[PDB]
Structures are given as structure tokens and as C-alpha cells.
Amino acid sequence: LQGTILQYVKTLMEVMPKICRLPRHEYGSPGILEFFHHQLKDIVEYAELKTVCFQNLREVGNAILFCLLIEQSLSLEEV
Amino acid sequence: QAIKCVVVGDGAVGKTCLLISYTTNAFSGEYIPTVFDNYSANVMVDGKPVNLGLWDTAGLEDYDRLRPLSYPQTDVFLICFSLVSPASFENVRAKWYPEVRHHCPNTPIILVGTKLDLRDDKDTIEKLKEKKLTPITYPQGLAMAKEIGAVKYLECSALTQRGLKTVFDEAIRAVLC
Amino acid sequence: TRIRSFLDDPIWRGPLPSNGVMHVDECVEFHRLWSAMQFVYCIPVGTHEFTVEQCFGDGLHWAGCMIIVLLGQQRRFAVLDFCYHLLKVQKHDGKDEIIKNVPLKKMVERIRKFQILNDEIITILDKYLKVRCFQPPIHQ
Amino acid sequence: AIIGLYNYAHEMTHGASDREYPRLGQMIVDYENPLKKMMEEFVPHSKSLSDALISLQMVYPRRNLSADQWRNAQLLSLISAPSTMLNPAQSDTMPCEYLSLDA
Numbered sequence: 001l002q003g004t005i006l007q008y009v010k011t012l013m014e015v016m017p018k019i020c021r022l023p024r025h026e027y028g029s030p031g032i033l034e035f036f037h038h039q040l041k042d043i044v045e046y047a048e049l050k051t052v053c054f055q056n057l058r059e060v061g062n063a064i065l066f067c068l069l070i071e072q073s074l075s076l077e078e079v
Numbered sequence: 080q081a082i083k084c085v086v087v088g089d090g091a092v093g094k095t096c097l098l099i100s101y102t103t104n105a106f107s108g109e110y111i112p113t114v115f116d117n118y119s120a121n122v123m124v125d126g127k128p129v130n131l132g133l134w135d136t137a138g139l140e141d142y143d144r145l146r147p148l149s150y151p152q153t154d155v156f157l158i159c160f161s162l163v164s165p166a167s168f169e170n171v172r173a174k175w176y177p178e179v180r181h182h183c184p185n186t187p188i189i190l191v192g193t194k195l196d197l198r199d200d201k202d203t204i205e206k207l208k209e210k211k212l213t214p215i216t217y218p219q220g221l222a223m224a225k226e227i228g229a230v231k232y233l234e235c236s237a238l239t240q241r242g243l244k245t246v247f248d249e250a251i252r253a254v255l256c
Numbered sequence: 257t258r259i260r261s262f263l264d265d266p267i268w269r270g271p272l273p274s275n276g277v278m279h280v281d282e283c284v285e286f287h288r289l290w291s292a293m294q295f296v297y298c299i300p301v302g303t304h305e306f307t308v309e310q311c312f313g314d315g316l317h318w319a320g321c322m323i324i325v326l327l328g329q330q331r332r333f334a335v336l337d338f339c340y341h342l343l344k345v346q347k348h349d350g351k352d353e354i355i356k357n358v359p360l361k362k363m364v365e366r367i368r369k370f371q372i373l374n375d376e377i378i379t380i381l382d383k384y385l386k387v388r389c390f391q392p393p394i395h396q
Numbered sequence: 397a398i399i400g401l402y403n404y405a406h407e408m409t410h411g412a413s414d415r416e417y418p419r420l421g422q423m424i425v426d427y428e429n430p431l432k433k434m435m436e437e438f439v440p441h442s443k444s445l446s447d448a449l450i451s452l453q454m455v456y457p458r459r460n461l462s463a464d465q466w467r468n469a470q471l472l473s474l475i476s477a478p479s480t481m482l483n484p485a486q487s488d489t490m491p492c493e494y495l496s497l498d499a
């Protein structure tokens with residue numbers, strides 16, 4: 001969390017739009033989707049998001065899931 | 080009490096910066112193309128409360144199909160052209176007025192002029208002379224406004240805020256009257 | 257609690273809101289970044305490439321939801337989210353177009369599934385873990 | 397039937413009808429179409445009734461707007477204007493804002 005993930009989050013924050021407000025319903029779903037894609041276009045082209053950050057996130061989620069599952073098993077054994 | 084004001088014009092003219100400066104008295108230098116932006120402002124006109132619905136529109140050519148989404152049920156149009164770019168001066172009559180008429184034939188138009196502070200600045204004037212172009216003058220603005228039918232043509236600068244409130248003060252009056 | 261304590265960098269929460277209540281427009285909070293991640297990996301990928309679930313499954317979503325919950329932004333994330341707003345608008349209007357090689361109906365269905373997963377994860381996290389007064393206006 | 401049975405029993409037990417029976421019977425036999433009779437009984441009160449009713453022209457029509465108007469006006473949304481989140485919502489007629497529509 002304090003290492004690779006922190007650096008990647010810091011790097012991604014800079015490229016994020018300075019201000020982004022949800023568009024009104026009058027524009028419609030297609031225009032809203034186009035606006036969101038244009039605003040977040042730079043994030044989409046980024047390649048390391050799906051190979052390192054995602055991987056790191058998967059590593060932190062599996063660890064917590066293993067912690068939760070181990071506890072339940074322990075409880076069952078104790079019962 | 081509700082007013083739907085839509086602001087249109089060529090790209091890189093100051094529409095978004097104009098709206099931001101008017102609404103929050105803040106100015107920025109960076110240029111960022113916009114697709115949809117909505118700003119709400121409450122003003123006292125003739126002692127009558129009014130809610131201003133400001134709708135920014137993209138000036139880039141790659142959003143013509145996506146522009147008319149904000150046109151319906153609009154009260155007043157605001158066409159803005161840079162004072163240090165004759166390109167926008169021509170593009171106004173070229174596209175903006177006919178498009179507004181096609182999509183809105185009975186709506187008032189308030190012609191506006193941006194970059195007033197740069198009208199007399201040196202570096203910009205010699206840079207424009209390099210291309211054999213000159214800043215737009217008051218008589219030309221009035222001539223174009225009366226040619227297209229705009230009921231009022233004004234000046235404003237998003238930096239010095241000179242003539243900033245009047246722009247919107249006349250538009251509310253245009254619909255109220 | 258230990259994982260929450262590990263989060264000490266100011267980047268996670270950002271500066272104080274200008275309006276003095278909460279961030280709405282500015283994207284200085286991690287929840288907006290997570291929403292952007294959801295938007296990018298919710299796009300239906302081609303047939304010759306793997307999806308997020310195939311490679312990462314639910315670990316990525318669990319980690320993101322845990323981070324959001326520990327940062328106390330689950331309500332803000334639910335209220336402020338690009339995918340959720342897009343799905344709501346699509347449901348309200350009901351339109352389907354190929355906007356930039358991206359089907360709309362499939363994308364909104366994927367968003368529906370992902371928010372269903374996220375809601376359950378956030379509810380579970382909240383179930384395991386479990387003011388500011390403003391002044392009125394003064395006459396001038 | 398109930399009124400008549402009670403009156404008859406009272407007369408039989410005491411020899412005289414109930415003191416308030418005649419007025420109740422007159423009211424009952426007069427009110428078979430209550431609206432039709434009130435349209436004539438309310439003539440003296442018509443001026444006051446119309447004066448009271450006309451005052452709702454500034455509240456009711458604006459409170460019966462369709463969902464499209466509410467969506468346009470972004471009714472009941474805190475996040476529509478974040479710079480004014482601390483401003484206390486208020487109006488010149490506070491009670492009329494939440495007054496029952498069916499009423």
C-alpha cells in the first residue's frame with residue numbers, strides 16, 4: 001500500500017481531470033458516455049494500469065480474503 | 080425566474096473562462112477543451128430574482144452532432160468571438176448565426192467580444208501584424224451585430240472583468256422584455 | 257483497523273473541501289480514481305484478450321472496496337460515480353448505440369453486475385467494522 | 397331505521413319523543429343529496445369561499461409540475477450547486493412548500 005500502489009495512485013492522480021461534474025440527463029446516455037470517454041481518455045490509453053496496479057490490487061484482495069476464510073475455518077474447528 | 084442561457088462560439092475564444100470568471104471571480108491560463116459544462120448564477124435584475132442557466136458548448140468541429148443537445152427551450156443565445164482573431168469574426172456569420180436560426184429561429188442573440196485586454200497589448204498586436212491581420216474594432220462589431228440581428232453587442236475580458244456583469248445583465252433584460 | 261492505519265498519506269483523502277462540507281466537482285479523492293478504474297475496466301474487451309474477471313476475479317474489487325470503506329467514502333463513491341450515473345441515464349432513456357466501438361447495453365449490464373458485487377462487498381465490510389455542526393447566517 | 401327505532405322505543409317507554417329527534421329527522425330527510433343542497437346553502441359564503449380559493453393560484457399550479465420539470469429544475473438535489481451547500485434553503489412561504497397536494 002505504501003509502495004508501488006502509492007506511487008501508481010500518485011501518478012494516476014495527476015492525469016485525472018482537474019474538475020469533473022456529472023452531466024445532466026438532457027444530454028442522453030450516448031453523449032454522456034462520449035463525454036466520460038473523452039475526459040478519461042488518457043487513463044484508458046495507460047497500459048500499466050491493467051498489469052501492475054490491478055495485479056497489486058489483486059494481491060491485496062486475495063490476502064484479505066485468505067484472512068477472512070482462515071478465520072471462519074478456525075471458528076468451525078473450534079466449534 | 081428561470082433563464083436558460085446557452086453560450087456558443089469558435090474554439091479557444093474564452094467562453095468557459097468567461098463563465099468561470101463571472102461565476103467565481105477566478106481566472107486561469109491553461110486551455111482545456113470542454114464538451115458539457117453547466118453553471119448556475121443568481122442575480123438581482125430590476126429587483127426581480129432570476130436564476131441563470133449557463134450552458135457551455137464545444138467550439139471544436141468534432142462536436143457538431145453533439146452540440147444541438149443544449150439548444151431546445153433556450154431563452155437567449157450568446158455568440159462569442161475573439162477580438163484578436165478575425166478567423167472567429169468570420170466564422171460567427173459563417174456558421175453560428177445560420178445554425179442558431181436553423182435550430183432556433185425566434186431566439187434573441189447577444190453578440191459578445193472577448194480578449195478586450197489584449198486588444199491594445201503590444202506583443203499580441205505585432206504578432207497579429209506578422210500575419211497581416213488586425214484586431215477587430217467597435218464599428219465592425221456593430222456592423223456585424225446589426226447584419227445578423229443581434230439586439231446588443233458588448234465587450235468583456237475574463238481577466239480584468241471589465242464589462243463582465245453587463246453582458247448577462249442585457250441578456251436577462253432581452254428575455255424579460 | 258491495521259490496514260486503515262497503514263493509510264496515512266494525504267493523497268488518499270486530499271485537501272479540505274472549498275465549500276467546507278465535501279468534494280463534489282474536484283477529483284482530489286481516491287474514490288474518483290476508483291470510479292475511473294471501474295469505467296476503464298468495465299468496457300467490453302475484444303474476443304482475443306482476457307477480461308478483468310478472468311485474470312483478477314473479485315480480488316481487485318474486494319481491495320478497492322476495502323480501501324474505500326477504510327477511507328470512509330463509500331457513500332460519496334455511491335453518490336459520485338461515472339458508471340452509476342451512466343447506467344441511471346441509460347435506464348431513464350433506454351438507448352443503444354455503438355459510441356466509439358463501445359456497445360452501450362452491454363456496458364451498462366456489466367456496470368449493473370459490478371455495482372451489485374460492490375454493494376455486497378461494501379455491506380459486508382461495513383457490517384464487520386461496526387458530529388460537525390454548522391452555523392446559521394447572521395444578519396448584516 | 398336506527399333513528400326511528402330509537403325514537404319509537406323512547407316514546408313507548410316514556411310516552412314522549414326525544415327532545416332533539418325532530419331536528420335530526422329534518423336534517424336526515426333534507427340531506428339526501430348533500431352536495432346539491434350545499435350548492436344552494438353556501439351562496440352567502442360564496443364570496444369568502446372564492447376569495448380563499450383564488451389565493452392558491454400562486455402555489456397549486458407550480459406544485460403539480462410533471463417529472464420533466466422537476467428533472468429540469470433538479471428538484472431536491474444537494475449536489476446540484478456545491479458552492480451553496482451551506483446556504484439554508486428557505487422561501488417566503490415555507491408552509492406551502494410541504495403542504496399536502498391531496499389537501
Ligand SMILES: Nc1nc2c(ncn2[C@@H]2O[C@H](COP(=O)(O)OP(=O)(O)OP(=O)(O)O)[C@@H](O)[C@H]2O)c(=O)[nH]1
Binds near residue numbers: 236
Ligand atoms: N489574457 C487573456 N486570456 C484570456 C481571456 N479570455 C480567455 N483567455 C484565454 O483564452 C484561452 C481560451 O479560452 P477558453 O474559454 O478556455 O476557450 P473555450 O472558449 O473554452 O473554447 P472551447 O473549449 O473550444 O469551446 C484560455 O487560455 C483562456 O485563459 C482574456 O480576457 N485575457
Ligand SMILES: [Mg+2]
Binds near residue numbers: 094113114135136
Ligand atoms: Mg469551451
